[PDB]
Amino acid sequence: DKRIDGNGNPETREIKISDYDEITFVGSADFEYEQSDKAPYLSVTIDENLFDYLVTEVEGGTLKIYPKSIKKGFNNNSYDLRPTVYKIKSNSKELKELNTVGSGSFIISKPTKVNRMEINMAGSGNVELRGPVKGYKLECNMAGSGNIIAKDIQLDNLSCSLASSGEIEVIGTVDRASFNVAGSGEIKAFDCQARKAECNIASSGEISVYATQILDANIVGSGEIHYKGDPEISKSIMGSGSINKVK
Amino acid sequence: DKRIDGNGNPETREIKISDYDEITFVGSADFEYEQSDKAPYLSVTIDENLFDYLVTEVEGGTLKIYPKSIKKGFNNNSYDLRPTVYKIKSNSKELKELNTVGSGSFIISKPTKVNRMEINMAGSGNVELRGPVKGYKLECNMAGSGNIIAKDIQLDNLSCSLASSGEIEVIGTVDRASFNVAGSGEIKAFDCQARKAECNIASSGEISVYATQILDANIVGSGEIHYKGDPEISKSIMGSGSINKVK
Numbered sequence: 001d002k003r004i005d006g007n008g009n010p011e012t013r014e015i016k017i018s019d020y021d022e023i024t025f026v027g028s029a030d031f032e033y034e035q036s037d038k039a040p041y042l043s044v045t046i047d048e049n050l051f052d053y054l055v056t057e058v059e060g061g062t063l064k065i066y067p068k069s070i071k072k073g074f075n076n077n078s079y080d081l082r083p084t085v086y087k088i089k090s091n092s093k094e095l096k097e098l099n100t101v102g103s104g105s106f107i108i109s110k111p112t113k114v115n116r117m118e119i120n121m122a123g124s125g126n127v128e129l130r131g132p133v134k135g136y137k138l139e140c141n142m143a144g145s146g147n148i149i150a151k152d153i154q155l156d157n158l159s160c161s162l163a164s165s166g167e168i169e170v171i172g173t174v175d176r177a178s179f180n181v182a183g184s185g186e187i188k189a190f191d192c193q194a195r196k197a198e199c200n201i202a203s204s205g206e207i208s209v210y211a212t213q214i215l216d217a218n219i220v221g222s223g224e225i226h227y228k229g230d231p232e233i234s235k236s237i238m239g240s241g242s243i244n245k246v247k
Numbered sequence: 248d249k250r251i252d253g254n255g256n257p258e259t260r261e262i263k264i265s266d267y268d269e270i271t272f273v274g275s276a277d278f279e280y281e282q283s284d285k286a287p288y289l290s291v292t293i294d295e296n297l298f299d300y301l302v303t304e305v306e307g308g309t310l311k312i313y314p315k316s317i318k319k320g321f322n323n324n325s326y327d328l329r330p331t332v333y334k335i336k337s338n339s340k341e342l343k344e345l346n347t348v349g350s351g352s353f354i355i356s357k358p359t360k361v362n363r364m365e366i367n368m369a370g371s372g373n374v375e376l377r378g379p380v381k382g383y384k385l386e387c388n389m390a391g392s393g394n395i396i397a398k399d400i401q402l403d404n405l406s407c408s409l410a411s412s413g414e415i416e417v418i419g420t421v422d423r424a425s426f427n428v429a430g431s432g433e434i435k436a437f438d439c440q441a442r443k444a445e446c447n448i449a450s451s452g453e454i455s456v457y458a459t460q461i462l463d464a465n466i467v468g469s470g471e472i473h474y475k476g477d478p479e480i481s482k483s484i485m486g487s488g489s490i491n492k493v494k
């Protein structure tokens with residue numbers, strides 16, 4: 001009933017889709033995405049038997065890829081797919097919002113221009129923005145033990161919120177940054193040069209920040225903010241946590 | 248410099264205070280609090296040598312009890328106090344807001360009448376509302392591995408928000424409930440009879456809910472909502488999580 005193992009015969013299907021500006025992706029695939037002015041494109045490779053258990057379509061301008069609800073299960077639960085291979089390649093004109101859930105990996109590799117890009121991840125997986133991202137606003141939100149890494153950003157605005165034990169890492173330059181941890185996890189942003197940054201920690205987590213002009217440093221709990229640069233810092237600590245300046 | 252051990256000679260001091268409607272409490276004490284129309288009262292018992300390292304005062308209508316910032320440490324950190332005995336007893340006319348951080352224990356035992364009471368905890372400690380709490384609204388918020396238990400509530404509104412791995416447990420009757428978990432933790436409310444409840448999980452946590460008329464059940468991740476009662480349920484799962492009805 002609930003668990004379906006891949007039969008070991010991988011099949012690739014190109015799926016006809018309209019453009020989309022939003023992705024709902026649930027699962028364990030390696031998903032490669034790019035923004036592109038070419039025609040919108042979707043290809044999925046998985047054990048041939050698992051397609052019958054998977055939704056893969058664009059609807060209402062949203063690409064939706066996830067395991068189906070269990071047949072006669074009243075949408076109380078979905079199938080637990082165990083593929084031997086699971087790869088997704090897709091593109092659209094713009095990605096304003098990614099909602100990803102699971103143990104998979106979502107990767108953007110080419111230079112990406114953004115107006116507002118929002119990344120929302122739940123689970124143990126990973127999102128990697130490997131290519132240069134440049135533009136107005138990037139938001140990286142996660143709840144879980146996995147991670148998000150943006151390797152090369154140039155932004156007016158960056159916002160990261162981490163719930164639970166995972167990790168967000170950001171590298172580049174930003175004018176204004178907001179870093180938030182609620183849990184034991186960690187934001188790593190020493191090589192993300194911010195002019196102004198706000199750092200908030202609830203509980204035992206950690207933020208490493210580089211702010212050049214203004215740093216607003218807030219901790220409620222045992223957590224820690226490590227900072228570099230020579231900003232003017234506003235400090236606020238309720239609990240056993242601590243703030244420290246590093247070279 | 249940072250860790251100060253109790254010298255094993257307990258001293259009790261009654262500290263003169265004005266009335267307060269808010270508490271900031273950081274540390275490991277057993278703190279007993281009640282609402283009362285008598286004169287405001289504070290008594291603290293701790294190893295005699297640790298008073299010098301402790302702030303204990305009412306300012307701006309807020310009772311503040313927390314370890315001091317390390318002398319000449321620029322408020323980057325505070326003393327790590329290791330008492331052999333640490334007890335606090337206090338009362339004020341009303342408690343609108345508690346902010347508690349640490350491994351301590353904050354207990355209210357008498358019948359308590361509330362308008363709006365908000366409890367904010369960070370850390371591994373606990374808050375117990377042992378006596379009957381009756382009134383308009385209770386809000387229980389925590390970030391950390393500890394717990395909040397309310398043993399006997401009767402409320403128009405209840406809101407509980409849990410970040411990280413800890414636990415909130417609520418027993419009684421409420422008209423409208425909102426239960427939120429962002430993390431691996433748990434809300435236990437099978438014994439809190441709600442008319443309408445909204446339940447939200449991000450990542451792998453759990454909620455046990457009892458709703459009689461209306462239940463709005465939302466999971467993003469692998470978490471689980473278990474419900475009892477016969478409400479009309481609205482279901483939304485994005486991920487491997489599930490919803491299940493129990494007797």
Ligand SMILES: [Cl-]
Pocket residue numbers: 264265266287
């Ligand atoms: Cl007074």
